[PDB]
Amino acid sequence: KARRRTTTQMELLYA
């Protein structure tokens, strides 16, 4: 689930 993921700066910037 999305709440457990650790999202990185680059995952926010680029598809």
Partner 1 sequence: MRERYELSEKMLSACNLLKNTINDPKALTSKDMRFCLNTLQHEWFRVSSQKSAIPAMVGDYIAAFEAISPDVLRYVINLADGNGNTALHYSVSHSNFEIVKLLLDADVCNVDHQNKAGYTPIMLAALAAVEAEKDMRIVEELFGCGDVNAKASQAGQTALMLAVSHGRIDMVKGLLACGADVNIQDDEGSTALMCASEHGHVEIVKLLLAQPGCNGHLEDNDGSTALSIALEAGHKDIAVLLYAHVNF
Residues that bind partner 1 (CB under 8 A): 1-9, 11-15
Minimum Å gap between C-beta 5 and partner 1 is 7
| Angstrom distances, CA of residue 4 to CA of 1, 7 | 6, 9
- How many contiguous H segments (helices) and E segments (strands) does the chain have? 1, 0
Minimum Å gap between C-beta 9 and partner 1 is 5
Minimum Å gap between C-beta 4 and partner 1 is 5
CA 2 to chain centre: 8
